[PDB]
Amino acid sequence: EMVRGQVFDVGPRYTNLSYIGEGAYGMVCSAYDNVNKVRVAIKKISPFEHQTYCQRTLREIKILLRFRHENIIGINDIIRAPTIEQMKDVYIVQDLMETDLYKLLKTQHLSNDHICYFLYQILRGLKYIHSANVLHRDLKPSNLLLNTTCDLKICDFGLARVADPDHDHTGFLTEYVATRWYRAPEIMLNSKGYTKSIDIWSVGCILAEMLSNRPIFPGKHYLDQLNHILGILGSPSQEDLNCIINLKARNYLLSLPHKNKVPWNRLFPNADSKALDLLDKMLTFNPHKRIEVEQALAHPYLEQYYDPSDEPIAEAPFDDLPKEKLKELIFEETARFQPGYRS
Numbered sequence: 001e002m003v004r005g006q007v008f009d010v011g012p013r014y015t016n017l018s019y020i021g022e023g024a025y026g027m028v029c030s031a032y033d034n035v036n037k038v039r040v041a042i043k044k045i046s047p048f049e050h051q052t053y054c055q056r057t058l059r060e061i062k063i064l065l066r067f068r069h070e071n072i073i074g075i076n077d078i079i080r081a082p083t084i085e086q087m088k089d090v091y092i093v094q095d096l097m098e099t100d101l102y103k104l105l106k107t108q109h110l111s112n113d114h115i116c117y118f119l120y121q122i123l124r125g126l127k128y129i130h131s132a133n134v135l136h137r138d139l140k141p142s143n144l145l146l147n148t149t150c151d152l153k154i155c156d157f158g159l160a161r162v163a164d165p166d167h168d169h170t171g172f173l174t175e176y177v178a179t180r181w182y183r184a185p186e187i188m189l190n191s192k193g194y195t196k197s198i199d200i201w202s203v204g205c206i207l208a209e210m211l212s213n214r215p216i217f218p219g220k221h222y223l224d225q226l227n228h229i230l231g232i233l234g235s236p237s238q239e240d241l242n243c244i245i246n247l248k249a250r251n252y253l254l255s256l257p258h259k260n261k262v263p264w265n266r267l268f269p270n271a272d273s274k275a276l277d278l279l280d281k282m283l284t285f286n287p288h289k290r291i292e293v294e295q296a297l298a299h300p301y302l303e304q305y306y307d308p309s310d311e312p313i314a315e316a317p318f319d320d321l322p323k324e325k326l327k328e329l330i331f332e333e334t335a336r337f338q339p340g341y342r343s
């Protein structure tokens with residue numbers, strides 16, 4: 001139990017603590033699990049002051065407790081106080097992961113084989129997620145935890161939602177949007193953060209980042225984000241212009257000079273041509289003409305790994321409450337890891 005950076009108190013089961021880092025309203029350490037005799041990761045979370053922090057916490061916990069897949073991080077144990085009034089911190093215990101794709105891309109240029117098998121694992125996990133009618137909504141390199149070239153896990157389901165192509169509100173900045181660089185164009189143009197297509201676009205961006213060691217659409221803001229995308233894909237066609245469900249949005253693009261489509265091979269000269277064909281289909285502007293997860297796995301680029309017999313799906317398809325009500329729901333969701341739990 002260290003006190004240098006916010007009291008941990010995860011003992012006596014979890015000892016020999018060591019600081020890793022800190023992200024998203026809390027802190028992260030690795031500890032020794034005296035029950036499983038192996039080092040695990042523990043994230044300390046203190047979200048109860050801010051209602052949005054309570055959203056993501058409850059959101060991620062409900063989903064991860066239901067999900068079970070090699071390519072998706074899980075929750076091993078949750079530590080919290082016996083009473084709601086005493087609970088000010090939550091401790092989520094997960095498998096220790098050596099690094100993530102973000103850190104890896106900073107130090108190494110990936111070979112084609114490791115890019116190929118990384119891509120498979122992402123889509124493998126994503127296939128499960130989408131089969132449960134769930135969208136991750138924030139897929140990016142830092143959310144891809146890594147041990148080896150063969151051990152990739154998807155994490156951070158804080159922004160995850162149940163798929164819902166129907167409901168729409170056009171609430172642009174009223175909803176906590178995804179990481180800009182990996183954000184589908186439909187989200188920025190006509191507010192569409194509830195279809196599976198958005199996750200595929202993110203994976204495309206991740207793929208392009210694996211081929212060149214740098215973000216492909218690194219805009220400063222959302223209009224600049226659209227600038228980068230059209231700067232590579234080219235000016236949207238007449239039909240793609242009709243996908244835009246917004247008056248003022250279908251205007252900034254029309255004032256922009258006409259852009260030619262930059263060939264993928266010109267951007268990535270050293271890339272596998274099969275990779276670039278898949279990339280092309282993941283980064284299609286039109287969300288309806290964009291490749292789906294099962295189709296991507298079946299692309300020739302992944303033909304050496306693709307195996308529907310070894311690609312598990314969900315056995316069953318899977319808010320605006322105050323921070324005090326959400327805290328109760330978190331207190332209930334974590335109640336299964338408490339002594340004396342019934343039903």
Ligand SMILES: c1ccc(CNc2ncnc3[nH]cnc23)cc1
Nearest residue numbers: 021022023028041094095096097
């Ligand atoms: C700061 C913020 C985020 C992270 C990434 N989490 C993390 N790191 C290591 N092992 C894990 N298992 C489950 N999650 C993790 C590290 C430092």
